[PDB]
C-alpha positions as semicolon CSV with decimal commas, in nm:
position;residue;x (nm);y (nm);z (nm)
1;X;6,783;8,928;11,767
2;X;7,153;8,966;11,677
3;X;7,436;8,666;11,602
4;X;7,616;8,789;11,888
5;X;7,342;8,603;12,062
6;X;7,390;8,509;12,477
7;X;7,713;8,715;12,459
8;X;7,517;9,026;12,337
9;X;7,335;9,042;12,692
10;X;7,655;8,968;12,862
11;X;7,854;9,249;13,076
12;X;8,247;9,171;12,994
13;X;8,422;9,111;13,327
14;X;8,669;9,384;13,186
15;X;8,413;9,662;13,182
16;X;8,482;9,981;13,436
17;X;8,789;9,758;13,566
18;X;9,130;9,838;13,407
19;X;9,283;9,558;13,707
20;X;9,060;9,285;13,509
21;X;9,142;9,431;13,128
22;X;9,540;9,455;13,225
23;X;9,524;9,070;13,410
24;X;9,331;8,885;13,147
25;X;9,416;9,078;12,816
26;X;9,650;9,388;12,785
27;X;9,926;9,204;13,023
28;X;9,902;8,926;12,730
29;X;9,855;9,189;12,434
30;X;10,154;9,372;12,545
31;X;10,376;9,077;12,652
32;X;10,264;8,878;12,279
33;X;10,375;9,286;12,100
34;X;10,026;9,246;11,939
35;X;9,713;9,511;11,919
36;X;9,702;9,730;12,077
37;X;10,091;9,690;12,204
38;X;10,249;9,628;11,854
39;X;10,580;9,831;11,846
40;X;10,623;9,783;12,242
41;X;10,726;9,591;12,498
42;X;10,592;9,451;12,841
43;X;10,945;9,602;13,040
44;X;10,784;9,991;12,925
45;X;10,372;9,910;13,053
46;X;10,406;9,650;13,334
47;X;10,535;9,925;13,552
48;X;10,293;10,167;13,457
49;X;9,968;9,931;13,453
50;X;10,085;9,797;13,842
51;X;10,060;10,134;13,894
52;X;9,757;10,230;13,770
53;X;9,602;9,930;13,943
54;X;9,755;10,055;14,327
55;X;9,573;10,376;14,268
56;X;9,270;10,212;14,146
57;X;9,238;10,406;13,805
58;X;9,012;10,238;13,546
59;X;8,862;10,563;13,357
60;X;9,109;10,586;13,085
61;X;8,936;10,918;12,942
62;X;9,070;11,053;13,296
63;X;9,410;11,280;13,260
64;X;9,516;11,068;13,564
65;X;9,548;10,720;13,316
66;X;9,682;10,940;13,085
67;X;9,969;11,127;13,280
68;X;10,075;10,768;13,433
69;X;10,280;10,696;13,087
70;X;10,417;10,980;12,995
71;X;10,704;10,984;13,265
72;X;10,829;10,658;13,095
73;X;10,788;10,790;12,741
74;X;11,067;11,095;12,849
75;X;11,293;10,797;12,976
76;X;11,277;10,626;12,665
77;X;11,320;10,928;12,437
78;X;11,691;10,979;12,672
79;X;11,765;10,652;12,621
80;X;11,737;10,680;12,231
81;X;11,937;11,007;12,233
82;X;12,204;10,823;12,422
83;X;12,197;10,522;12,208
84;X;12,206;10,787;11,914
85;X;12,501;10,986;12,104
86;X;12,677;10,613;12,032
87;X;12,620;10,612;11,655
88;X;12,397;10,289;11,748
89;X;12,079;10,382;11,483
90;X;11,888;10,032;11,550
91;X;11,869;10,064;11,885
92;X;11,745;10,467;11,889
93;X;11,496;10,375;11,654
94;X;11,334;10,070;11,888
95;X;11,369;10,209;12,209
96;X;11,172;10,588;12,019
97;X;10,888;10,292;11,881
98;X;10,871;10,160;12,214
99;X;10,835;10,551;12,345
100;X;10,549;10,566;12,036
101;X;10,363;10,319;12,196
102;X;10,337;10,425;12,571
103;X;10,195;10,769;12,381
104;X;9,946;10,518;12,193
105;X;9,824;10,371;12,525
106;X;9,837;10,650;12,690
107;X;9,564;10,833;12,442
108;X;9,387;10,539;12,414
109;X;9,096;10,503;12,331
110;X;9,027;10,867;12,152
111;X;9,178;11,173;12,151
112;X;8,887;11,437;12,179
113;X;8,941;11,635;11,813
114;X;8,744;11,940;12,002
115;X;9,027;11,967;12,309
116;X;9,325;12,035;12,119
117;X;9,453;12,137;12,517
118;X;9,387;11,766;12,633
119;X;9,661;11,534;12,784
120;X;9,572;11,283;12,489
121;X;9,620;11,558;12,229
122;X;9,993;11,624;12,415
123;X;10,077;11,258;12,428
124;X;9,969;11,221;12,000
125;X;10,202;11,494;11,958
126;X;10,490;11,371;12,152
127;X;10,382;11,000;12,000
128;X;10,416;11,152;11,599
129;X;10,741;11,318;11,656
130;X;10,887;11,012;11,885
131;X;10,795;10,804;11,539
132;X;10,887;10,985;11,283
133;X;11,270;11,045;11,423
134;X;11,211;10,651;11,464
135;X;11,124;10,594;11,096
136;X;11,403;10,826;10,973
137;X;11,658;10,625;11,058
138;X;11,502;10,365;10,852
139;X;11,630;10,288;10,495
140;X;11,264;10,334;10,352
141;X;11,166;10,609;10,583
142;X;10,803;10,712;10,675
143;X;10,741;11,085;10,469
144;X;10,476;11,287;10,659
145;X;10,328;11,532;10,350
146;X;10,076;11,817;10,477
147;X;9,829;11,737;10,129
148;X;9,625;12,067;10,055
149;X;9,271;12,001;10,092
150;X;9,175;12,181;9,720
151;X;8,842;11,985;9,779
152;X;8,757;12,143;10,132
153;X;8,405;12,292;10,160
154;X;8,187;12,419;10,451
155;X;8,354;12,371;10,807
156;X;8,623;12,161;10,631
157;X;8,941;12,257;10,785
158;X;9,262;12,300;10,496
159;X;9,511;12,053;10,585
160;X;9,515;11,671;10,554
161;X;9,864;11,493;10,707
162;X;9,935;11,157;10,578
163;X;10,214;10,887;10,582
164;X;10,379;10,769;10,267
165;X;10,601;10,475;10,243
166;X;10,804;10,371;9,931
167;X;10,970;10,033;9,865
168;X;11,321;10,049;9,724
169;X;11,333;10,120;9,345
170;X;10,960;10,309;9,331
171;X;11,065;10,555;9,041
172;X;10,891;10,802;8,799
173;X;10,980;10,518;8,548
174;X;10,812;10,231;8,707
175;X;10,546;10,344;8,921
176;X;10,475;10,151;9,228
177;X;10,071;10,043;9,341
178;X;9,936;10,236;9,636
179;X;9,806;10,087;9,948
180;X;9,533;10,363;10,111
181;X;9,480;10,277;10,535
182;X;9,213;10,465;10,645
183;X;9,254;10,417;11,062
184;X;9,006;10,443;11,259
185;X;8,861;10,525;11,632
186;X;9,224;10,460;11,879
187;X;9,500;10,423;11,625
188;X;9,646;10,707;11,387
189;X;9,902;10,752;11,106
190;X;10,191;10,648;11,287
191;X;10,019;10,331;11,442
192;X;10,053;10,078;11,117
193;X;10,466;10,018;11,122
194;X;10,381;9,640;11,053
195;X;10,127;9,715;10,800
196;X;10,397;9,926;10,594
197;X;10,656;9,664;10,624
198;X;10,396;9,366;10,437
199;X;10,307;9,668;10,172
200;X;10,695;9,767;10,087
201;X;10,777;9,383;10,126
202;X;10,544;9,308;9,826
203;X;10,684;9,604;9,623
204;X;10,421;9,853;9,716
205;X;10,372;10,190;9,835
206;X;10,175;10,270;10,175
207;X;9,997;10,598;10,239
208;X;9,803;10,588;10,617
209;X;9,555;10,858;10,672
210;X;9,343;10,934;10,900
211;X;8,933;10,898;10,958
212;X;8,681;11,175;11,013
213;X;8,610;11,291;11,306
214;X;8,991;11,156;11,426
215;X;9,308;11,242;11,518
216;X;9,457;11,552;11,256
217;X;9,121;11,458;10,970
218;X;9,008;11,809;10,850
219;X;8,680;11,587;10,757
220;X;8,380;11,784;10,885
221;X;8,261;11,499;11,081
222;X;7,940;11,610;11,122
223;X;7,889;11,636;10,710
224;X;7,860;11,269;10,595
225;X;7,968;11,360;10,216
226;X;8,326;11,504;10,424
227;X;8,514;11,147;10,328
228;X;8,397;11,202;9,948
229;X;8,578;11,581;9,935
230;X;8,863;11,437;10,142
231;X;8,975;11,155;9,941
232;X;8,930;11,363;9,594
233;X;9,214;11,598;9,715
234;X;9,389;11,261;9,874
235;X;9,391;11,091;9,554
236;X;9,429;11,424;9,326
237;X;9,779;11,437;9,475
238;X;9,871;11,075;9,444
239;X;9,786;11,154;9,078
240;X;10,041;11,470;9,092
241;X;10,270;11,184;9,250
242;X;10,534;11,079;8,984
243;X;10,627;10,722;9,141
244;X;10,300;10,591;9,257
245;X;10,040;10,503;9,033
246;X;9,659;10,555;9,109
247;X;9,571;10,316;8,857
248;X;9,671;10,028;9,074
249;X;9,557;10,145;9,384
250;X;9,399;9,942;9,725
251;X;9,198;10,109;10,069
252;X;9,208;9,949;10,338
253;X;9,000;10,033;10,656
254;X;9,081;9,936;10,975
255;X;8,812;9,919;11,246
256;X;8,600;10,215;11,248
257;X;8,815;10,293;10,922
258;X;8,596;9,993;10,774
259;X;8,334;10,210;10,744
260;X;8,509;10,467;10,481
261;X;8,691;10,173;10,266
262;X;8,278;10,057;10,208
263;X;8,213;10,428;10,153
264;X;8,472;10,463;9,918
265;X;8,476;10,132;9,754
266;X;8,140;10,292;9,628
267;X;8,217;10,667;9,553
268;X;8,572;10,616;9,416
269;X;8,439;10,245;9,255
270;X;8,597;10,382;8,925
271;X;8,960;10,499;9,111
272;X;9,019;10,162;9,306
273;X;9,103;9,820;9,243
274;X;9,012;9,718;9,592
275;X;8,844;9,821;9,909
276;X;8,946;9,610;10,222
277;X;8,729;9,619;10,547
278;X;8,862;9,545;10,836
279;X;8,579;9,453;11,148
280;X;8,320;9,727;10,992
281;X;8,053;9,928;11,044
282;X;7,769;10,064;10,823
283;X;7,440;10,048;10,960
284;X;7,325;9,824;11,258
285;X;7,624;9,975;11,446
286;X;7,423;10,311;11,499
287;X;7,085;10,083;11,598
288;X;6,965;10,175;11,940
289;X;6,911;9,867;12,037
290;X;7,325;9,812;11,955
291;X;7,422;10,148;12,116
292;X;7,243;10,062;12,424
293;X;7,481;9,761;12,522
294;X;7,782;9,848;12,291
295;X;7,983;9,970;12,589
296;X;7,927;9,611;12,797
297;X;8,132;9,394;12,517
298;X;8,505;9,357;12,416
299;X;8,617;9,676;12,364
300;X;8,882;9,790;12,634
301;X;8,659;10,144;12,811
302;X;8,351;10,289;12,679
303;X;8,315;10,371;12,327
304;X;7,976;10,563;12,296
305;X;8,159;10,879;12,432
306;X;8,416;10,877;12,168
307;X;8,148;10,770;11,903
308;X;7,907;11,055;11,945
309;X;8,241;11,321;11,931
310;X;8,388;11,125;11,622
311;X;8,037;11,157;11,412
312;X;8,002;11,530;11,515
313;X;7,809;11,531;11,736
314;X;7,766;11,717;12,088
315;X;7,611;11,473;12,299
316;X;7,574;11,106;12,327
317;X;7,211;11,160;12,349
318;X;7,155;11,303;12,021
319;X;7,423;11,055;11,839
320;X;7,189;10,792;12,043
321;X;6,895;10,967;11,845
322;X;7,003;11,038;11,496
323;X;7,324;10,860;11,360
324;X;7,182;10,593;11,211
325;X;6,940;10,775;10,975
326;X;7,226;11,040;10,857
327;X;7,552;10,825;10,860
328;X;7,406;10,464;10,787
329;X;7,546;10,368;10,420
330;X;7,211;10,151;10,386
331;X;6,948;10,415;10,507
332;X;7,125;10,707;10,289
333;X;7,161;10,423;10,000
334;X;7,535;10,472;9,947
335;X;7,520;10,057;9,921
336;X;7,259;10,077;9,615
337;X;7,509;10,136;9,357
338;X;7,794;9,920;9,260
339;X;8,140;9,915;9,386
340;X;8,480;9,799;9,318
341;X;8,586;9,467;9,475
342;X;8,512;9,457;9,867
343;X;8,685;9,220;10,094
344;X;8,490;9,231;10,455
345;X;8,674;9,062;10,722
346;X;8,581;9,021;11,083
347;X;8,481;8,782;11,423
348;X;8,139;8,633;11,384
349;X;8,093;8,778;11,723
350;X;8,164;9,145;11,724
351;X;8,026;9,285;11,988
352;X;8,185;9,650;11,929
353;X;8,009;9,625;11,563
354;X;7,761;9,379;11,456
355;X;7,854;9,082;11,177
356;X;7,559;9,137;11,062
357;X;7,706;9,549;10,899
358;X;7,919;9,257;10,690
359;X;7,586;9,061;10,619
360;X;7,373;9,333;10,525
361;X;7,635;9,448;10,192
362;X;7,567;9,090;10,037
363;X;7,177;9,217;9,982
364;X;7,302;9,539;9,758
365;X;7,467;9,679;9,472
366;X;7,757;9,423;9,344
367;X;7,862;9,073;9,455
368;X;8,062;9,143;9,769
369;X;8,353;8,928;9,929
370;X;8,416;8,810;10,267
371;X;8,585;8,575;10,548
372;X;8,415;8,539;10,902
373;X;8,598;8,381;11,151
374;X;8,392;8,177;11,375
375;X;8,366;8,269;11,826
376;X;8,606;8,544;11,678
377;X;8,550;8,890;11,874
378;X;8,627;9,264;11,693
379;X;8,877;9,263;11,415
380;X;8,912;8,824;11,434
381;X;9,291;8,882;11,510
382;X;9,535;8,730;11,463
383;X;9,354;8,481;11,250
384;X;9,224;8,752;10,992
385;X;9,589;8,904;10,907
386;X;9,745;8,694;10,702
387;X;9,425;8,659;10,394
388;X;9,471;9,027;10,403
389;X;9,806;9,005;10,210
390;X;9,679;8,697;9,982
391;X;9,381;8,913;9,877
392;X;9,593;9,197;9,811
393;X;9,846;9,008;9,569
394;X;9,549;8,853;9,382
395;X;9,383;9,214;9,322
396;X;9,721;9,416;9,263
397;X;9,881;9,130;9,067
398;X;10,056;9,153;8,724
């Protein structure tokens, strides 16, 4: 039925075996510096990963995985201290990114918003403060600003933490566009270093929050009008903003982010430029039929368990049951009105989200845009990068 096809009813040789995932993948991820290991290197996780293969450890929701890192993250913070001791700013800044990033794997692939006394929740921590003495040393730092929520309602929490970035020169008297990341299911606010560096190279400002139902998102992710109240007090304070101007102003979703750059593309359609969507869901992602073999595809461990918990729910049962009627943007008709200008990227076969959640936005509302890369698998990296930038030019050009 789906254009996954054969590979849909295919277990991944990765799947319930971090040995096979490390050998054939991560080892390759991490050695290349690309997703998940951007920001690291292979010296910091090829210890760590032998080790977790000896013992035979492949659940990575497990405080076991999880504790296995977070010697080598103390090691590297020393290091950077020393280096520091030294005067030497370049190096304390790499070797506190490369501490960043054994956090990142270490929490990967969720960090459970309801166990704020989890392992994962300790290692996000450790990662955010790691990072942002990291980015400090930097000549356009990362500026973590704790944005009042004005717009909260219900069992909205108060408090919504978000990265901005300037490039040199952004002043009250030329006002800079904004780039908007929305992140998504495994990587957070301080997981985008790359990202910031292409936005401030180009003259821009970044701001990187975070998803409901992830990470520090005061988003009641169980409300699916949360993301509408969330980015009116988001964008209400990058109107109180003197140096970055709203008026020129891109989102761009990342994974499970994709899904709230669509969303917003729609209810903010008057506030934004752009949307970009970055391997998205919106509907046949919550199908039954989808859920039932999501967890036997490309992504690293299972994802159901972190689903259900990141769309509010209790059990995977119920999420199983009901999240396609209350959180699918064609069901609740969210796609029936227009929107500003959409670009949907992603691997024709997606086996984490189907191409066909790209598909379906070309029979609604206004003329959508797209690029699908062909055998490509979640996300189509590397090749789906680099049009990213050239579509953001175009749209934020003057």
């Amino acid at each position: 039925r789906w254009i996954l096809g054969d590979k849909f009813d295919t277990v991944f040789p990765h799947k319930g075996s971090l040995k096979v995932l490390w050998e054939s993948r991560w080892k390759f991820a991490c050695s290349k510096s690309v997703y998940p290991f951007h920001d690291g290197s292979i010296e910091d996780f090829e210890p760590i990963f032998n080790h977790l293969i000896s013992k035979n450890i492949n659940d990575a929701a497990s405080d076991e995985y999880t504790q296995a890192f977070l010697p080598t993250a103390s090691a590297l913070e020393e290091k950077a201290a020393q280096a520091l001791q030294a005067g030497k700013h370049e190096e304390a800044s790499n070797l506190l990114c490369r501490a960043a990033v054994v956090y990142r794997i270490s929490r990967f692939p969720y960090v459970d918003i309801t166990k704020p006394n989890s392992i994962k929740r300790v290692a996000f921590e450790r990662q955010k403060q790691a990072y942002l003495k990291a980015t400090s040393l930097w000549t356009q730092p990362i500026r973590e600003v704790t944005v009042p929520h004005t717009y909260r309602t219900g069992n909205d929490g108060a408090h919504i933490p978000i990265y901005i970035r300037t490039p040199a020169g952004a002043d009250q008297s030329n006002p800079v566009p904004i780039v908007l990341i929305m992140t998504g299911l495994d990587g957070y606010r301080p997981d985008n270093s790359q990202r910031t560096h292409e936005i401030l190279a180009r003259g821009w400002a970044a701001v990187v929050a975070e998803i409901p139902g992830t990470a520090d998102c005061p988003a009641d992710p169980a409300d699916p009008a949360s993301p509408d109240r969330l980015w009116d007090s988001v964008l209400s304070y990058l109107d109180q903003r003197p140096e970055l101007n709203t008026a020129k102003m891109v989102v761009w979703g990342l994974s499970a982010g994709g899904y709230y750059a669509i969303r917003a593309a729609h209810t903010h359609r008057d506030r934004l430029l752009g949307a970009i969507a970055h391997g998205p869901g919106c509907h046949y992602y919550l199908d039954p039929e989808w859920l039932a073999k999501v967890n036997d595809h490309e992504y690293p461990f299972e994802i159901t368990a972190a689903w259900a918990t990141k769309h509010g729910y209790k059990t995977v049962e119920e999420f199983v049951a009901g999240a396609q009627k209350k959180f699918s943007l064609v069901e609740t008709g969210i796609v029936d009105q227009p929107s500003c200008r959409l670009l949907l990227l992603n691997g024709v076969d997606d086996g984490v989200v189907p191409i066909e959640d790209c598909l379906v936005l070309f029979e609604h509302g206004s003329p959508k845009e797209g690029r699908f890369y062909k055998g490509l698998p979640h996300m189509g990296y590397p090749n789906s990068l680099p049009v990213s930038y050239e579509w953001l030019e175009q749209v934020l050009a003057s």
